[PDB]
Design a binder for this molecule. Structure first.
Ligand SMILES: [Ca+2]
Ligand SMILES: [Zn+2]
Length: 206
């Protein structure tokens, strides 16, 4: 799990969030086995974003192919235990905005955070992604984990290749849809990379 200095840094980093500010939350993966979480405050730009290795490899392969496009191999070096640690430290009675609340509600309740309230902004699914292309054009550098091809079924038949779903860029584009343009304030990560990923192997000497 997390060490001591680590945990204290995580808690300090999160205090950078304004407990009364508008805050989006989005996850990828099922709520019992999430693989990517983002918590984003558009007014000040601050976001908490991290990953988790799945326990169910089979369901993970389907989500990779039909939702997030993450390669399981790229999750082998994430820091364990962040999901429970972050959820435990969220401010009391915080009000979070989301696009579809049912799975997030289950995740939060599973961690005994029934005090956190959810506002389902309830945009139609295409409207919610109006600014998808613009947000990837501008912010792709903020998450490079979505490497695989993603296809989804259309209701009225057939399938199509779509842009992969990223918890972070989904928050950014949902804010863009609400404000009617991609001109959100500059987003900035609150977590250091060393809290998100295990220390990598030593660099190759080139
Ligand atoms: Ca999403
Ligand atoms: Zn992502």
């Amino acid at each position: 799990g997390l060490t001591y200095s680590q945990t204290m840094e995580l808690k300090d980093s999160m205090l950078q969030l304004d407990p009364n500010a508008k805050t989006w939350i989005d996850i990828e993966g099922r709520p019992e086995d999430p693989v990517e979480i983002a918590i984003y405050q558009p007014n000040n730009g601050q976001y908490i974003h991290f990953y988790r290795e799945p326990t169910d490899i089979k369901q993970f392969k389907q989500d990779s192919k039909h939702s997030h496009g993450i390669d399981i191999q790229d999750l082998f070096s994430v820091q364990p235990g962040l999901t429970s640690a972050v959820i435990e430290s969220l401010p009391k009675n915080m009000v979070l905005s989301c696009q579809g609340a049912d799975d997030i509600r289950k995740l939060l309740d599973s961690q005994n955070r029934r005090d956190i309230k959810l506002i389902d902004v309830s945009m139609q699914k295409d409207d919610a992604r109006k600014f998808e292309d613009k947000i990837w054009d501008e912010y792709k550098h903020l998450c490079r984990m979505h490497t695989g091809i993603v296809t989804q079924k259309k209701k009225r038949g057939g399938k199509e290749e779509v842009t992969p779903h990223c918890a972070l860029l989904d928050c950014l584009m949902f804010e863009a849809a609400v404000i009617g343009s991609p001109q959100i304030p500059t987003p900035r990560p609150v977590l250091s990379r060393d809290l998100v990923f295990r220390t990598g192997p030593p660099r190759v000497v080139l």
